Amino acid sequence: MTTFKLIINGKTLKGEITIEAVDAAEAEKIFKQYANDNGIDGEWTYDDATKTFTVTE
């Protein structure tokens, strides 16, 4: 069960949409694409302690 999350730290989007992926690396890609489709572009940080990223805008 590899469900990675993503906290959005910016005016665009705001939550932790959980998604499954081969590893956190792919999750960051799925998260880094899901953000563009909405307009989320800023910073990015992965949390290996909570399996959650952090996309700022």
UniProtKB/Swiss-Prot annotation:
It is found in: Secreted, Cell wall. This is Immunoglobulin G-binding protein G. The chain holds residues 372 to 427 of 593 of the full protein. Sequence repeats lie at residues 3-57. It comes from Streptococcus sp. group G.
